[PDB]
Amino acid sequence: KREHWATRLGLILAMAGNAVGLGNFLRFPVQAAENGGGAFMIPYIIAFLLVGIPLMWIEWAMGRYGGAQGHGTTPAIFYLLWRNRFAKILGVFGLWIPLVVAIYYVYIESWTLGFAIKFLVGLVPEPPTDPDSILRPFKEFLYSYIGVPKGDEPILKPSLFAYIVFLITMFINVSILIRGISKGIERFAKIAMPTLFILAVFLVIRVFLLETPNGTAADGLNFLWTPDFEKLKDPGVWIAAVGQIFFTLSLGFGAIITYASYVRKDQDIVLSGLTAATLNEKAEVILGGSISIPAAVAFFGVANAVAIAKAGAFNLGFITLPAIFSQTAGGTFLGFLWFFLLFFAGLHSSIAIMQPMIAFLEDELKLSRKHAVLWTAAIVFFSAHLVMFLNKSLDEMDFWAGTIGVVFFGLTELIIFFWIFGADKAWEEINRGGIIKVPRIYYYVMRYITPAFLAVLLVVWAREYIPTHWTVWITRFYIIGLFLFLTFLVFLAERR
Ligand SMILES: CCCCCCCCO[C@@H]1O[C@H](CO)[C@@H](O)[C@H](O)[C@H]1O
Ligand SMILES: CCCCCCCCO[C@@H]1O[C@H](CO)[C@@H](O)[C@H](O)[C@H]1O
Ligand SMILES: CCCCCCCCO[C@@H]1O[C@H](CO)[C@@H](O)[C@H](O)[C@H]1O
Ligand SMILES: CCCCCCCCO[C@@H]1O[C@H](CO)[C@@H](O)[C@H](O)[C@H]1O
Ligand SMILES: CCCCCCCCO[C@@H]1O[C@H](CO)[C@@H](O)[C@H](O)[C@H]1O
Ligand SMILES: CCCCCCCCO[C@@H]1O[C@H](CO)[C@@H](O)[C@H](O)[C@H]1O
Ligand SMILES: CCCCCCCCO[C@@H]1O[C@H](CO)[C@@H](O)[C@H](O)[C@H]1O
């Protein structure tokens, strides 16, 4: 036997939680603003239907199939679906990807905590018109916290505050994970997910009331959701939608499979998975599209709305919005809520992105939950020093694991399960015990459409983003060693 989810609600709130921390409140509207505004819904909804939902259900079934046999991670689950030596090595990726993401994500999550503390106590720059006059003091503020050097220097010089807050952040993640699934992860989601919703609605209401001489939030929603179907001719818009889907549903990160391995043998996953995925989609379109960009376009105007979009999602949430809140009534408290929202949202994703390593140490190496959590914490905390001190090291990990990895591994899940294990055998496994059954239209979708989409996407990135700065070689060296480390642990699990 193993740990199990206590309630259907807690399972859904925990499953939906591991995608709200991926920054979709910033990620989605930026992608929508740069791919036809409201016309981006056609690629986004289709990618949500032809790629997201089928790959989501697939990850739910692979976890429950593995969890019934006591295996919450993919080095063992792949071996069940494909009795082969190549399947165990491919399974290492489903343990390597979430571990590498945690090595830099928890540190980023710690930024939101430290920024929430500084805003709460008022230790923020308070300017004083032009955007650079307002944005630059908060650019220095983030760069002084992270320790970004002034030039091409390879060394980061993070503040002691950022380091201490990172320690505190790791302590919070351990406190949730060391309690377990029901006592820890599920108890956290049932409380924080509703709190995130209430807190997000307040920001939405507070943003809709923004009025500056340069624009209104109505212009922000108008700019964000004005459709332009001329963009739909460009295949790049469809590339951005499918890749976006991997983040609204957290596909390929190894988190859905591990969380689903604690779903009991016959408990429903079809309806419970569709609800958690629908919760993810609506929460990022409504709440996410009503805060970040509307507040940005309202403050700077429609003239800078194009520049805000090209600036990117991360700059919007760590530079632009704090600078906007700085110039609004009660904005020091408003900035606290924004970073409090990002922290507690990210807290759902970090505990879920470290559970596969914990489940592996538990299921395959027979370690206690206490020792599995603390060893996982030690591996992540130690390795994060590479991200905290080496410039552009975060980017290198985010590229191999966060970008290419989840799309490559998502294609791997769909092939091992729906082709090698048997499509009919896989279809039985998904719809088994389902309160609602998957429509048979998704059979052709899972077997042909979704793998084709992921194959087209992988080649596009293999052509565009395949080709100085020797510090990335150190990062490549370290994450490759982590793969050798996990392969050795998988090997040690076979001997036991
Ligand atoms: C606590 C978590 C903070 C969430 C911030 C994530 C916002 C996403 O930000 C985007 O992420 C991409 C990679 O994922 C990068 O390539 C983009 O440059 C960046 O703008
Ligand atoms: C691998 C675990 C080792 C923990 C010790 C690492 C200490 C690095 O921490 C450093 O301590 C300095 C003290 O002034 C601070 O100025 C730096 O901001 C901080 O990065
Ligand atoms: C100054 C910041 C302190 C943060 C600590 C509280 C953060 C909220 O997190 C809580 O921490 C508790 C620690 O025991 C855990 O028991 C709870 O499970 C967890 O929800
Ligand atoms: C940030 C958006 C995602 C948060 C969604 C959490 C919504 C509250 O979550 C749950 O929804 C159920 C249906 O109303 C209620 O019965 C439960 O009391 C509540 O915990
Ligand atoms: C009493 C509860 C108030 C909820 C938050 C509202 C914050 C008010 O904020 C104010 O609202 C005005 C429009 O009414 C605008 O001029 C500005 O957005 C702002 O000055
Ligand atoms: C350096 C990585 C630490 C690995 C996790 C172990 C944390 C050490 O904690 C140990 O846990 C044991 C549990 O029985 C206790 O008996 C010990 O008193 C305690 O020191
Ligand atoms: C899982 C969330 C990933 C964190 C988002 C990345 C934020 C770190 O910073 C980002 O690094 C990127 C590297 O590609 C750059 O493209 C962005 O310009 C930069 O903002």
Residue numbers in the entry: 4 to 131, 135 to 473, 479 to 507
Could you pull the original sentences from the published paper?
Neurotransmitter:sodium symporters (NSS) terminate the signal transmission in brain by active reuptake of neurotransmitters from the synaptic cleft through a Na+-dependent mechanism. To address this fundamental aspect of NSS function we purified LeuT in a Na+- and substrate-free state. Importantly, the structures show that an invariant Leu25 of the unwound region of TM1 is rotated and positioned into the substrate-binding pocket, while Glu290 remains occluded from the extracellular environment, presumably in a protonated state. The structures pinpoint Leu25 of LeuT—a completely conserved residue in the NSS family—as a key residue for stabilization of the empty substrate and Na+ sites associated with the inward-to-outward conformational transition.
The intracellular side of the transporter is fully closed, while the extracellular side is slightly more open than for the outward-oriented, Na+/substrate-occluded state. At the unwound part between TM1a and TM1b, we observe a key difference to the Na+-bound forms at the substrate-binding site: Leu25, which is conserved in all NSS, has rotated due to a neighbouring flip at the polypeptide chain, and it now directs the side chain into the vacant S1 substrate-binding site. Indeed, no electron density is detectable for Na+ ions at the Na1 or Na2 sites. Importantly, the current structures show a buried Glu290 with no positive charges to compensate a negatively charged carboxylate (as opposed to the Na+-bound states) and an increased predicted pKA indicating that Glu290 is protonated and neutral.
